[PDB]
């Protein structure tokens, strides 16, 4: 594991967020894009506002964040910027549904979101579970997600990085379990079944947040919603992020080609023309249903569904040639 320097965390400790950002960070639509240097500080701020200034020891939190950043790779999409975008969306959901979640869950989710794609290499689970890379042998299913959780624990195990050490033995194992299930939920393969079960529970009136299995599922859907959140930004931001997503997809197709294997259209750079149709397909089958079910369970999350609907409309315009 890569460790942060003394200057990085001490600098973060000293960091103060400008006044104008305080109001904007509360909004679902907020884009972290223009404030790169402020990203670690934005996370500290969100943790302090949701959990409290004394929830974690400042020094441990700043060492933890700075080492988490160092363990994200310089890949086009599944990087540090993605981690912070996902954490911000979680913050907006938690702020708008505050008392539905325990202090331990809010702490656990904000941390899980920042750590959810730790050490990502820009390669899918399918790629690993085919050309049997060591990771797929270690983790048969949700390959990268089990690795992201393993990396989260290894960062906590670094000297003076354990932010949860002050919790009781029961609360510490609970927080890790919240984190583990949250990170596993970000395996898109699991989302489809999770949303269907949630749709059924809500529709029949079976859904019950005091039921731990129901609670685990709702958290899971929140994880997908935060993971997918670039589809809820303003069109220029959404469009530019989509270019990073496909840069990784095409690079996977390129590595497949070098190894003598034909990639799917989505991962084929010689098939760029099919992208708008693939995105419409993605919004209709994955994104729109995700935000629709989430809005049903947590009504204050409706602006995410509206923003996703606007971007679906922008992909439709691209298709018709407008
Ligand atoms: C066909 O269009 C896609 C296929 C796909 F599989 C994943 C896609 C995706 N289009 C978008 C916009 C997108 C966003 C924001 N996030 C993800 C995502 C979620 C989980 N794991 C990896 C990715 C890339 N996707
Ligand atoms: Cl690493
Ligand atoms: Mg992931
Ligand atoms: Zn992700």
Coordinates of C-alpha atoms and ligand atoms in Angstrom, one line a residue:
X1 CA 0.0 0.0 0.0
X2 CA 1.2 3.5 -0.9
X3 CA 1.4 5.8 2.1
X4 CA 1.0 9.6 2.3
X5 CA 3.9 11.9 3.3
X6 CA 3.8 14.1 6.5
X7 CA 3.4 17.3 4.3
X8 CA 0.2 16.0 2.6
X9 CA -1.9 15.1 5.7
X10 CA -0.6 18.2 7.7
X11 CA -1.5 20.3 4.7
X12 CA -5.0 18.7 4.6
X13 CA -5.3 19.3 8.4
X14 CA -4.5 23.0 7.9
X15 CA -6.9 23.3 4.8
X16 CA -10.1 25.4 5.1
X17 CA -12.9 25.3 2.5
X18 CA -14.0 28.7 1.0
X19 CA -17.5 30.1 2.1
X20 CA -19.1 30.0 -1.4
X21 CA -18.6 26.2 -1.7
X22 CA -20.4 25.4 1.7
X23 CA -23.8 26.2 0.2
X24 CA -23.2 24.4 -3.2
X25 CA -21.7 21.1 -1.7
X26 CA -25.3 20.5 -0.3
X27 CA -26.8 20.3 -3.7
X28 CA -27.2 17.0 -5.6
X29 CA -26.1 18.6 -8.9
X30 CA -22.8 19.9 -7.5
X31 CA -19.7 19.2 -9.7
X32 CA -16.4 18.9 -7.9
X33 CA -14.6 19.2 -11.3
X34 CA -13.2 22.8 -11.0
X35 CA -11.7 22.3 -7.5
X36 CA -9.1 19.5 -7.8
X37 CA -6.8 20.8 -5.0
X38 CA -9.8 21.0 -2.6
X39 CA -11.0 17.4 -3.1
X40 CA -9.4 15.9 0.1
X41 CA -10.7 19.0 2.0
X42 CA -14.3 18.6 0.5
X43 CA -14.4 15.0 1.9
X44 CA -13.1 16.1 5.4
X45 CA -15.9 18.8 5.3
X46 CA -18.6 16.4 4.3
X47 CA -17.5 13.9 7.1
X48 CA -17.4 16.7 9.7
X49 CA -20.9 18.0 8.6
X50 CA -22.5 14.6 8.5
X51 CA -20.7 12.8 11.4
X52 CA -19.2 15.6 13.5
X53 CA -15.8 17.2 14.0
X54 CA -14.9 14.7 16.8
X55 CA -16.3 11.5 15.1
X56 CA -12.7 10.8 14.0
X57 CA -9.4 12.0 15.3
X58 CA -8.3 14.7 12.8
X59 CA -4.8 13.4 12.3
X60 CA -6.0 9.8 11.6
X61 CA -8.7 11.0 9.1
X62 CA -6.2 13.2 7.2
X63 CA -3.6 10.4 7.0
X64 CA -6.4 8.0 5.9
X65 CA -7.7 10.4 3.1
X66 CA -4.2 11.2 1.8
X67 CA -3.2 7.5 1.6
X68 CA -6.6 6.6 0.0
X69 CA -5.9 9.2 -2.8
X70 CA -2.4 7.8 -3.3
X71 CA -3.9 4.3 -3.8
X72 CA -6.1 5.3 -6.7
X73 CA -4.4 4.8 -10.1
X74 CA -4.0 7.5 -12.8
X75 CA -6.6 5.7 -15.0
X76 CA -9.0 7.7 -17.2
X77 CA -12.2 7.1 -15.2
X78 CA -11.9 4.8 -12.1
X79 CA -9.7 7.3 -10.3
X80 CA -9.5 9.7 -7.3
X81 CA -11.9 12.2 -9.0
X82 CA -14.5 9.4 -9.4
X83 CA -14.1 8.4 -5.7
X84 CA -14.8 12.0 -4.5
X85 CA -17.8 12.4 -6.9
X86 CA -19.3 9.2 -5.5
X87 CA -18.6 10.3 -1.9
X88 CA -20.3 13.7 -2.6
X89 CA -23.5 12.1 -4.0
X90 CA -23.7 9.9 -0.8
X91 CA -23.3 13.0 1.3
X92 CA -26.2 14.7 -0.6
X93 CA -28.4 11.5 -0.1
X94 CA -27.5 11.3 3.6
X95 CA -28.1 15.0 4.2
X96 CA -31.6 14.8 2.7
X97 CA -32.5 11.6 4.6
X98 CA -30.3 12.2 7.7
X99 CA -32.3 10.4 10.6
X100 CA -33.1 7.3 8.4
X101 CA -29.5 6.2 8.9
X102 CA -27.5 5.7 12.1
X103 CA -24.3 7.6 12.9
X104 CA -22.3 4.3 12.2
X105 CA -24.0 3.9 8.8
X106 CA -23.4 7.5 7.7
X107 CA -19.7 7.2 8.7
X108 CA -19.4 3.8 7.1
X109 CA -21.1 4.9 3.8
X110 CA -19.1 8.1 3.3
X111 CA -15.9 6.1 3.8
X112 CA -17.0 3.1 1.6
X113 CA -17.8 5.6 -1.2
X114 CA -14.3 7.1 -1.1
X115 CA -12.7 3.6 -1.0
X116 CA -15.1 1.8 -3.4
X117 CA -12.8 1.6 -6.5
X118 CA -9.4 1.7 -4.6
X119 CA -6.5 0.4 -6.8
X120 CA -8.8 0.0 -9.9
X121 CA -6.8 -0.8 -13.1
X122 CA -9.4 0.2 -15.7
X123 CA -10.3 -3.4 -16.3
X124 CA -13.8 -5.1 -15.8
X125 CA -14.6 -8.2 -13.8
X126 CA -15.4 -10.1 -17.0
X127 CA -11.8 -9.4 -18.3
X128 CA -10.3 -10.9 -15.1
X129 CA -12.9 -13.8 -14.9
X130 CA -11.9 -15.1 -18.4
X131 CA -8.1 -14.8 -18.8
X132 CA -7.9 -15.8 -15.2
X133 CA -5.8 -13.1 -13.6
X134 CA -4.6 -13.8 -10.0
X135 CA -7.5 -11.5 -8.7
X136 CA -10.2 -13.7 -10.2
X137 CA -8.7 -16.9 -8.6
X138 CA -8.7 -15.1 -5.1
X139 CA -12.3 -13.7 -5.8
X140 CA -14.5 -15.8 -8.1
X141 CA -17.4 -13.2 -8.0
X142 CA -17.4 -9.4 -7.6
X143 CA -13.6 -9.6 -8.2
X144 CA -12.5 -6.0 -8.2
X145 CA -15.0 -5.2 -5.4
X146 CA -13.6 -7.7 -3.0
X147 CA -10.1 -6.3 -3.9
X148 CA -11.4 -2.7 -3.2
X149 CA -12.6 -3.8 0.3
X150 CA -9.3 -5.7 0.9
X151 CA -7.4 -2.4 0.0
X152 CA -9.8 -0.4 2.3
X153 CA -8.8 -2.7 5.3
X154 CA -5.1 -2.6 4.4
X155 CA -5.2 1.3 4.4
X156 CA -7.0 1.2 7.9
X157 CA -4.2 -1.2 9.1
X158 CA -1.4 1.4 8.3
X159 CA 0.2 3.2 11.3
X160 CA -2.1 6.0 12.5
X161 CA -4.6 5.4 9.7
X162 CA -7.2 3.5 11.8
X163 CA -10.1 6.0 12.0
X164 CA -12.5 3.4 13.6
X165 CA -10.1 2.3 16.4
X166 CA -12.1 4.4 19.0
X167 CA -15.4 2.5 18.3
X168 CA -16.4 -0.4 20.5
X169 CA -15.5 -3.9 19.4
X170 CA -19.1 -4.5 18.3
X171 CA -19.4 -1.1 16.5
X172 CA -16.0 -1.7 14.7
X173 CA -17.1 -5.1 13.2
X174 CA -20.5 -3.5 12.4
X175 CA -18.8 -0.5 10.5
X176 CA -16.5 -2.9 8.5
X177 CA -19.5 -5.1 7.6
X178 CA -21.5 -1.9 6.5
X179 CA -18.4 -1.0 4.3
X180 CA -17.9 -4.5 2.9
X181 CA -21.6 -4.9 1.8
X182 CA -21.6 -1.3 0.4
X183 CA -18.5 -1.8 -1.7
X184 CA -19.8 -5.3 -2.9
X185 CA -23.1 -3.6 -3.9
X186 CA -21.1 -1.4 -6.4
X187 CA -20.6 -4.5 -8.6
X188 CA -23.1 -3.6 -11.3
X189 CA -23.8 -7.4 -11.9
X190 CA -25.6 -7.4 -8.4
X191 CA -27.6 -4.2 -9.0
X192 CA -30.3 -5.7 -11.4
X193 CA -31.4 -8.3 -8.9
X194 CA -31.2 -5.8 -6.0
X195 CA -33.4 -3.2 -7.8
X196 CA -36.0 -5.9 -8.7
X197 CA -36.3 -7.2 -5.1
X198 CA -36.6 -3.5 -4.0
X199 CA -39.2 -2.8 -6.6
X200 CA -41.3 -5.8 -5.4
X201 CA -40.9 -4.9 -1.6
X202 CA -42.0 -1.3 -2.3
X203 CA -44.9 -2.2 -4.7
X204 CA -46.4 -4.8 -2.3
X205 CA -45.8 -2.7 0.8
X206 CA -43.4 -5.3 2.2
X207 CA -40.4 -2.9 2.4
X208 CA -39.3 -2.3 6.0
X209 CA -36.2 -0.3 6.9
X210 CA -36.1 -1.9 10.5
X211 CA -35.6 -5.3 8.6
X212 CA -31.7 -5.6 8.2
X213 CA -32.0 -7.5 5.0
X214 CA -34.2 -4.7 3.5
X215 CA -31.9 -2.1 4.9
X216 CA -28.8 -3.8 3.3
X217 CA -30.7 -3.7 -0.1
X218 CA -31.6 0.0 0.2
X219 CA -28.0 0.8 1.1
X220 CA -26.9 -1.2 -2.0
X221 CA -29.3 0.8 -4.3
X222 CA -27.9 4.1 -2.7
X223 CA -24.4 2.8 -3.6
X224 CA -25.4 2.2 -7.3
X225 CA -27.0 5.6 -7.4
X226 CA -23.8 7.3 -6.1
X227 CA -21.6 5.2 -8.4
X228 CA -23.7 6.2 -11.4
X229 CA -24.0 9.9 -10.5
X230 CA -22.1 11.4 -13.5
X231 CA -25.4 10.7 -15.3
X232 CA -27.0 13.3 -12.9
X233 CA -24.7 16.2 -13.7
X234 CA -25.1 19.0 -16.3
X235 CA -24.8 17.7 -19.9
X236 CA -21.2 19.1 -20.6
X237 CA -19.9 17.4 -17.4
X238 CA -21.8 14.1 -18.1
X239 CA -20.6 14.1 -21.8
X240 CA -16.9 14.7 -20.8
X241 CA -17.1 11.9 -18.1
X242 CA -18.6 9.5 -20.7
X243 CA -15.4 10.1 -22.8
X244 CA -13.3 8.9 -19.8
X245 CA -15.5 5.8 -19.2
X246 CA -15.1 4.8 -22.9
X247 CA -11.3 5.6 -22.9
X248 CA -11.0 2.8 -20.3
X249 CA -13.5 0.5 -22.2
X250 CA -11.6 0.9 -25.5
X251 CA -8.2 0.4 -23.7
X252 CA -9.6 -2.9 -22.4
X253 CA -10.6 -3.8 -26.0
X254 CA -7.1 -2.9 -27.2
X255 CA -5.4 -5.1 -24.5
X256 CA -7.9 -7.9 -25.5
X257 CA -6.9 -7.4 -29.2
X258 CA -3.1 -7.6 -28.4
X259 CA -3.9 -11.0 -26.6
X260 CA -5.9 -12.2 -29.7
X261 CA -9.4 -11.7 -28.5
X262 CA -12.3 -9.7 -30.1
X263 CA -14.0 -7.2 -27.7
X264 CA -17.7 -6.3 -27.4
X265 CA -18.9 -3.1 -29.3
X266 CA -18.8 -1.0 -26.1
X267 CA -15.1 -1.9 -25.7
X268 CA -14.3 -1.5 -29.5
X269 CA -12.7 1.9 -30.4
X270 CA -13.5 1.1 -34.1
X271 CA -17.2 1.2 -33.1
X272 CA -17.5 4.7 -31.6
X273 CA -20.6 5.3 -33.8
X274 CA -22.7 3.0 -31.6
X275 CA -21.9 4.8 -28.3
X276 CA -25.0 7.2 -28.3
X277 CA -27.3 4.2 -28.8
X278 CA -25.4 2.2 -26.1
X279 CA -25.8 5.2 -23.7
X280 CA -29.6 5.4 -24.4
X281 CA -29.7 1.7 -23.7
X282 CA -27.8 2.2 -20.5
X283 CA -30.0 5.0 -19.2
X284 CA -33.2 3.2 -20.0
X285 CA -32.3 -0.3 -18.6
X286 CA -29.9 0.7 -15.7
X287 CA -29.8 4.5 -14.8
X288 CA -33.5 5.6 -15.1
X289 CA -34.8 2.4 -13.2
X290 CA -32.1 2.9 -10.5
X291 CA -33.1 6.6 -9.8
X292 CA -36.8 5.8 -10.2
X293 CA -36.7 3.1 -7.4
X294 CA -34.5 5.2 -5.2
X295 CA -36.9 8.2 -5.5
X296 CA -39.8 5.8 -4.6
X297 CA -37.9 4.7 -1.4
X298 CA -36.3 8.0 -0.5
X299 CA -38.5 10.9 -2.0
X300 CA -35.9 13.7 -1.2
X301 CA -33.6 12.0 -3.9
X302 CA -36.0 13.0 -6.8
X303 CA -33.5 15.7 -8.2
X304 CA -31.1 12.8 -9.2
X305 CA -33.9 11.2 -11.3
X306 CA -34.8 14.6 -12.9
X307 CA -31.1 15.2 -13.8
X308 CA -30.8 11.7 -15.2
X309 CA -34.0 12.3 -17.3
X310 CA -32.5 15.5 -18.7
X311 CA -29.3 13.6 -19.8
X312 CA -31.4 10.8 -21.4
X313 CA -33.1 13.6 -23.4
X314 CA -29.5 14.9 -24.4
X315 CA -28.5 11.3 -25.6
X316 CA -31.8 11.1 -27.6
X317 CA -31.0 14.5 -29.3
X318 CA -27.4 13.1 -30.2
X319 CA -29.1 10.0 -31.8
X320 CA -31.6 12.1 -34.0
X321 CA -28.7 14.3 -35.2
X322 CA -29.7 17.5 -33.3
Ligands
LIG1 C1 -23.3 1.1 -22.0 O1 -22.9 2.1 -21.1 C2 -22.3 1.7 -19.9 C3 -22.0 0.3 -19.7 C4 -21.4 -0.1 -18.4 F1 -21.1 -1.4 -18.1 C5 -21.1 0.8 -17.4 C6 -21.4 2.1 -17.5 C7 -22.0 2.6 -18.8 N1 -22.4 4.0 -19.0 C8 -22.2 4.9 -18.0 C9 -22.6 6.2 -18.3 C10 -21.6 4.5 -16.7 C11 -21.4 5.2 -15.5 C12 -21.6 6.6 -15.1 N2 -20.9 4.2 -14.6 C13 -20.8 3.1 -15.2 C14 -20.2 2.0 -14.5 C15 -20.9 1.4 -13.3 C16 -20.2 0.3 -12.6 N3 -19.0 -0.2 -13.1 C17 -18.3 0.3 -14.2 C18 -18.9 1.4 -15.0 C19 -18.1 2.0 -16.2 N4 -21.2 3.1 -16.4
LIG2 CL1 -2.2 -0.6 -3.7
LIG3 MG1 -16.2 -0.3 -9.0
LIG4 ZN1 -17.2 3.3 -9.0

